[PDB]
């Protein structure tokens, strides 16, 4: 039995998104221990695949994998048992994560050691985010270039969409802990919407990279913590098409992001995704956890808690 | 003796300039062989210092920083035998480059393994710019994410003005040849001129360094030839601080820049700073090599040559 552990992915924004950029895309991110994953992969007995733990939209594209690289790598067919699953549509990048967990698992016990880029790929996953896929074997925090636009983008829909774009940059996160909320949100509809808000104008575009690159990363490489809260709450609260996901979340996820900034002893907050799970830095922890447990008890958060920053990637030890 | 081989620095631009951005500065460059410097540290027998080679600006700062750094290590009085200087002020980041490259060689001469960091802000080098320091013992490709601005930035003037900016991107450079141009351009007056120039407006902030982190860099990372044109030559004719550069200098660099721009067999072009040194990038370089000898003998450039990135750094080895 191989016995993988990986963390799961905090995004902070989506970048390049107008008509007219050089590149669309990009995704600036960072990896933590909670919520985490933690799967054993073994040969099944009968010689047919399964999968336990989670839910059956993962369960099977977990045995499509299974079954894939069964017969891409010769190997036997193998149980996987995830014992503790990423929260699903949460914001957390479970389905990119689990799979090249487990597809890398399954690769160490067969014999090969396989690269996560090309297993992403041959999984289907990483068409638009190189987040999960440079978090996994990397860890700590990144930022994705995106894909290139071809001559004909103007005119644009090539926004919404096999290449997993590599990490442009990649930080060690510095040890800040970092306060994980589960907000009311909900988790079509959305591809409706992404149309209406996107393309998105030229200035804003340039002005996300100008937060992402010339805010966050420099902040986070010097370890500079007052900086680095002053870029996410910019994003969080000015990123055009971080509002867009905001204001349309509504009310469930705008109310804690507005408690936060209230709130002195939360320094930044931030939305992953448009998932519920939202996340804030404090140099007050003592007083954020108070703050925390005030409002999961009034029942405007359905959880909280603090974790810290994977700066590995998903990590395998053999056991039996 | 220490022997010690250095590259130069091409700049491709400065990236955060407005009144209100969060960081300042930020600069986009990357390291080739030649122009090179190479230099020979080794005991002066009589016990008194000495540099040979280069002009008198570096030869005194040469001394100044062998002299500190004696006293600082408690080595010998060292001779440096600079038998390939880098050429001063012409936008190729020579006194940086010596000075670390020399500075570590005399390190070698005595026990320590400086850091080029330290050495830099021992030194007074790298108060703007990460650029040389960086490509100092990384080579390559990087981008620096400059200094954060303080609260009381809303006036500026503090865009003019210690602490050496680490790299925030860092990146091989693809095996692609580099085109060296030498034109006719000059090397007080700036100063007046940059507060002229600058600050520049919020939206040229944001668009360079969206240019710089999602034209640029992905390009390279990708090794991506026809996008990393693309962002070099949009940077070039359209970077507000870049025209800024060119216009000021005038046609000495503009005819040369509108030349490669027009040559069928120069795919794209670039001014290094704003000193007489050029660069430029092709697919068929030996094209390239007929209409820049052509440039030569007509008078427009004083020199050219082929190069390569370097993607180590300085390198020293033992001699006698
Ligand atoms: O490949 P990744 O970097 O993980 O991201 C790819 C997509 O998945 C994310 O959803 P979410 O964060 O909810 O993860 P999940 O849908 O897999 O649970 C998000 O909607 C991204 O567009
Ligand atoms: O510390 P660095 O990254 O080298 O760059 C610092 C400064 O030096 C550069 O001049 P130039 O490229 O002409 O080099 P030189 O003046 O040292 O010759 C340029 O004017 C930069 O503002
Ligand atoms: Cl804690
Ligand atoms: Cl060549
Ligand atoms: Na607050
Ligand atoms: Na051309």
């Given at each position: 039995?191989?016995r993988?552990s990986?963390?799961?992915?905090?995004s902070?924004?989506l970048?390049?998104?107008?008509?007219?950029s050089?590149?669309?895309?990009?995704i600036?991110?960072?990896?933590?221990?909670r919520?985490?994953?933690?799967?054993?992969?073994?040969?099944?007995?009968?010689?047919?695949?399964?999968?336990?733990?989670?839910?059956?939209?993962?369960?099977?594209?977990?045995?499509?994998?299974?079954?894939?690289?069964?017969?891409?790598?010769?190997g036997?067919?193998?149980?996987?048992?995830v014992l503790?699953?990423?929260?699903?549509?949460?914001?957390?990048?479970?389905?990119?994560?689990?799979?090249?967990?487990?597809?890398?698992?399954?690769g160490?016990?067969?014999?090969?050691?396989?690269?996560?880029?090309?297993?992403?790929?041959?999984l289907g996953?990483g068409?638009?985010?190189?987040?999960s896929?440079?978090?996994?074997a990397?860890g700590?925090?990144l930022?994705?270039?995106?894909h290139?636009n071809?001559?004909?983008?103007?005119?644009?829909?090539?926004?919404?969409?096999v290449?997993?774009?590599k990490?442009?940059?990649?930080?060690d996160?510095?040890?800040?802990?970092?306060?994980?909320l589960?907000?009311?949100?909900?988790?079509?509809?959305?591809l409706?919407?992404?149309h209406?808000?996107?393309?998105?104008?030229?200035?804003?575009?340039?002005?996300t990279?100008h937060?992402?690159?010339?805010?966050?990363?420099?902040?986070?490489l010097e370890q500079d913590?007052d900086?680095?809260?002053?870029?996410?709450?910019?994003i969080?609260?000015?990123?055009h098409?971080?509002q867009?996901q905001?204001?349309f979340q509504?009310?469930?996820?705008?109310?804690?992001?507005?408690?936060?900034?209230?709130?002195?002893?939360?320094?930044?907050?931030?939305?992953?995704?448009?998932?519920?799970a939202?996340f804030?830095?404090?140099?007050?922890?003592?007083?954020a956890?108070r703050?925390?447990?005030?409002?999961?008890?009034?029942?405007?958060?359905?959880?909280f808690?603090?974790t810290?920053?994977?700066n590995?990637?998903?990590?395998?030890?053999?056991?039996?």
């Amino acid at each position: 039995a191989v016995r993988v552990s990986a963390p799961a992915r905090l995004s902070f924004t989506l970048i390049s998104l107008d008509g007219s950029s050089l590149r669309r895309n990009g995704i600036a991110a960072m990896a933590v221990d909670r919520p985490g994953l933690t799967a054993e992969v073994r040969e099944a007995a009968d010689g047919i695949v399964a999968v336990t733990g989670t839910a059956e939209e993962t369960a099977r594209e977990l045995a499509a994998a299974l079954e894939a690289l069964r017969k891409l790598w010769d190997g036997p067919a193998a149980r996987v048992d995830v014992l503790e699953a990423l929260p699903q549509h949460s914001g957390f990048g479970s389905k990119t994560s689990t799979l090249l967990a487990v597809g890398h698992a399954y690769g160490r016990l067969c014999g090969v050691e396989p690269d996560l880029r090309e297993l992403a790929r041959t999984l289907g996953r990483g068409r638009t985010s190189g987040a999960s896929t440079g978090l996994s074997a990397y860890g700590g925090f990144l930022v994705d270039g995106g894909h290139v636009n071809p001559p004909d983008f103007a005119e644009a829909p090539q926004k919404y969409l096999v290449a997993p774009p590599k990490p442009v940059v990649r930080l060690d996160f510095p040890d800040w802990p970092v306060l994980v909320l589960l907000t009311h949100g909900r988790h079509q509809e959305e591809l409706e919407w992404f149309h209406s808000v996107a393309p998105i104008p030229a200035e804003e575009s340039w002005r996300t990279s100008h937060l992402v690159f010339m805010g966050l990363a420099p902040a986070v490489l010097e370890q500079d913590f007052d900086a680095f809260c002053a870029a996410v709450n910019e994003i969080t609260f000015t990123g055009h098409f971080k509002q867009a996901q905001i204001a349309f979340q509504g009310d469930a996820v705008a109310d804690v992001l507005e408690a936060g900034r209230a709130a002195p002893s939360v320094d930044a907050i931030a939305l992953s995704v448009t998932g519920p799970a939202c996340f804030a830095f404090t140099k007050r922890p003592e007083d954020a956890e108070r703050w925390a447990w005030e409002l999961k008890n009034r029942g405007l958060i359905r959880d909280f808690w603090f974790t810290r920053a994977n700066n590995q990637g998903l990590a395998t030890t053999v056991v039996s």
